[PDB]
Amino acid sequence: PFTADKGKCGLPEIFDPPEELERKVWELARLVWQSSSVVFHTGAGISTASGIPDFRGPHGVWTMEERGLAPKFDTTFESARPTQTHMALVQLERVGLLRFLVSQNVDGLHVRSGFPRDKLAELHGNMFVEECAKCKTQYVRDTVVGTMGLKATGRLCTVACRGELRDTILDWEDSLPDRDLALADEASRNADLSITLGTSLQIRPSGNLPLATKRRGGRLVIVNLQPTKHDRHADLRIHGYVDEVMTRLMKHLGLEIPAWDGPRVLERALPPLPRPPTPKLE
Amino acid sequence: KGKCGLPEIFDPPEELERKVWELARLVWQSSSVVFHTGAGISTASGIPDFRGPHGVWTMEERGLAPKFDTTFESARPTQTHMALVQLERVGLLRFLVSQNVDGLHVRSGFPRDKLAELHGNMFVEECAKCKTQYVRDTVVGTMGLKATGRLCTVACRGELRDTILDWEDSLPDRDLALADEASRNADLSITLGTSLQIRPSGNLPLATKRRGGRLVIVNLQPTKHDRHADLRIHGYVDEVMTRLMKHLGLEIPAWDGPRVLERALPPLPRPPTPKLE
Ligand SMILES: Nc1ncnc2c1ncn2[C@@H]1O[C@H](COP(=O)(O)OP(=O)(O)OC[C@H]2O[C@H](O)[C@H](O)[C@@H]2O)[C@@H](O)[C@H]1O
Ligand SMILES: Nc1ncnc2c1ncn2[C@@H]1O[C@H](COP(=O)(O)OP(=O)(O)OC[C@H]2O[C@H](O)[C@H](O)[C@@H]2O)[C@@H](O)[C@H]1O
Ligand SMILES: O=C(O[C@H]1Cc2c(O)cc(O)cc2O[C@@H]1c1ccc(O)c(O)c1)c1cc(O)c(O)c(O)c1
Ligand SMILES: O=C(O[C@H]1Cc2c(O)cc(O)cc2O[C@@H]1c1ccc(O)c(O)c1)c1cc(O)c(O)c(O)c1
Ligand SMILES: [Zn+2]
Ligand SMILES: [Zn+2]
User: Fold this and answer.
1) Which atom, in ligand 3's list, is nearest to the CA of A54?
2) What residues are paired with B232 via a beta bridge?
3) Which residue of B has its CA nearest to A247?
């Protein structure tokens, strides 16, 4: 743990100039329109505009540690609002333009945004989730459960069981949830488009999943302020704030970014809603 | 640049719950409420403060850089920003005094005739000739009340200039006069995310205490005037303010993107009041 390699921390950030940024987001529009099966891969960079620090950015948790300083939080995990990027992905799933959502974030804000749990894989677990040791039953709480490392929380199952409730937060040596990884594996492989937002792609197998989309001819788009493990394999790379990227994208798609009325859990995706007709391309 | 990077205080859960109940009680019994904001109400949208552990001046002093997790154009009003829209709309807020240049008060749709922008607005340029101001969709590009290179279109062709005060620059006499009036004639002054080290900006809440007004200070770090507070809350303003709106029975209204409202609209209905003693 103390020993855990935290990979490359504190790389310099890149900024596309505004004419390049505009042209890259249009091209992204073009790929979303042409693409039958779009998967989104997300990471700690999509939550930074809500006051939760990343791991490996300039003021990341691992970065600050390495220079002997502390990360800073501007909210509690309970008071934290889903970002524009979060709500734009809610909408893209509602209108049937997102097929699946693969996240490394434990920050719980995908679930709180309202995003359907049967189209999300939480590869690293969820700070608001506990799970019965005995029956595998998961409980989505309004407050952080209080333990990390798949340890006992101090509450007992109430299904009719009384099994031991435990946190979902993996430690360094912990095998990824096999249900969430298999679903994420299948959705990455059958994707013809994988878009990574605010991940540096350094954690295996999480950060390799987008690469499975490039077999039998899929396209990869990396959106990221810093470099990432896989920039070499990207058809498009956008250096820019995820919220600026995703609001320009929704505007190109003619969709609005939906309201957030506070924490909610949806188990199962609702039937698809209307979406605008497509531009002619070529 | 004053005291930069003092350590943070955190009220424990029961004390925090009891302080916000009591703020609720002060809001119910108060005739004329003013809100005094600073850079701390925007940190949960990825704009750093000036004097916090990772504030701009604080990081300068340590020869490190501040971090923006957004652009000023992409920044979204926080829960705090929208709760203050709602409290003005139901008539519980008399006036808003802000030290912020971030331009989000206005973008939140808060009415300009009830706001004082003590330190200017990065989206605002002002004709030197006819004093007409323009609220833009992008930051105007200059600081220090310098020429932006656009010209007036009032029929004037005058020189347009940024509104961002520098260190030696007097405060806008209109915004300071209404700020002072409002501070003097209040019975409750509430400060949110300001250290209160800048004068006169940070001295205004004190004018409420003369002829026996109350003052509430809500801040993570200490502040110049903790001594003159009738209540001090050591909490994230979003948590403080979401629980306050709950105690008053109000909703936090929806942001529909960047909008400018010049003049306050007519007051909307509010819940009736509790019994107090
Ligand atoms: N607003 C933003 N816009 C775009 N990029 C951003 C923004 N803010 C930050 N970033 C960038 O977004 C990227 C965030 O990458 P990392 O900090 O490694 O987080 P992970 O999700 O990849 O970490 C995976 C796991 O490792 C941990 O040990 C846990 O186990 C995590 O679950 C960086 O390059 C930032 O430049
Ligand atoms: N989520 C939060 N909740 C509560 N407090 C917070 C939060 N985040 C930060 N803070 C606190 O919020 C406080 C922020 O205070 P300062 O950083 O001095 O900003 P100012 O408005 O007073 O600066 C005045 C002028 O000086 C400048 O030069 C410009 O001219 C400004 O206009 C700190 O104590 C944090 O502890
Ligand atoms: O994981 C928990 O703590 C957070 C803060 C943190 C940290 O300060 C150091 C660190 O090594 C890990 C770490 O993980 C989280 C975090 C950090 C950064 C992010 O970007 C992000 O989204 C989330 C956690 C989990 C539970 O189940 C609990 O019940 C509980 O009380 C706390
Ligand atoms: O002010 C501008 O930049 C921000 C970063 C910054 C800084 O790095 C040093 C400093 O002295 C002032 C300063 O002011 C801003 C700021 C920072 C922190 C806050 O909390 C906050 O509300 C606002 C600004 C304004 C324009 O019109 C421009 O065209 C332009 O390029 C920049
Ligand atoms: Zn059980
Ligand atoms: Zn003019």
Assistant:
1) 20
2) B217
3) B74
CA distances from B181 to A275, B114, B187, B205 (A): 52, 12, 12, 11
Q: Are residues A181 and A100 in the same domain?
A: yes
Give the Cβ contact number of residue B149 at 10 Å. Answer: 10
Q: Omega into B200 within 30° of 0, i.e. cis?
A: yes
Residue type, A32: V
Using CA atoms, how far apart are residues A119 and A273, in angstroms rounded to an integer?
A: 16
CA of B155 to the centre of ligand 1 (A): 51
Q: Which residues line ligand 1 (CB under 6 A)?
A: A 43-45, 48-49, 54-57, 60, 104, 124, 198-200, 202-203, 224-226, 241-242; B 69
Number of residues assigned to chain A: 282
Sign of CA pseudo-dihedral B77, B83, B89, B94? negative
The answer on B26 and B144 residing in a single domain is no
Q: Which domain holds residue B246?
A: 12-119+169-264
Question: B215-219 contacts: CB < 8 A, separation 24 or more?
Answer: B215/B188, B215/B189, B215/B190, B215/B191, B216/B23, B216/B26, B216/B188, B216/B189, B216/B190, B216/B191, B217/B191, B218/B190, B218/B191, B218/B192, B218/B193, B219/B40, B219/B191, B219/B193, B219/B194, B219/B195
Query: What is the three-class DSSP state of A197?
Result: strand
A142–chain B Cβ distance below 8 A for any pair: no
Resolution in A: 2.0
Q: Are residues B71 and A247, on separate chains, in Cβ contact within 8 Å? A: no
Query: Which residues make Cβ contacts (< 8 Å) with residue A235, sequence separation at least 6?
Result: A31, A219, A220, A221
Cis peptide before A205 (omega within 30 of 0): yes
Q: How many CA atoms lie within 13 A of B132 on its CB side?
A: 12
Position B29 in a domain: yes
Give bridge partners of residue A237 from the DSSP assignment. Answer: A222
Q: Do residues A157 and A233 both lie within one domain?
A: no
- Cα nearest neighbour of A53 on chain B: B69
From A110, A124, A230, A239, the catalytic residue: A124
Residues A120, A138: one domain? Answer: no
Ligand nearest to the CA of B156: 6
| Residues whose CB is less than 8 angstroms from the CB of residue B241 and which lie 6 or more positions away in sequence, other chains included | B79, B80, B83, B84, B192
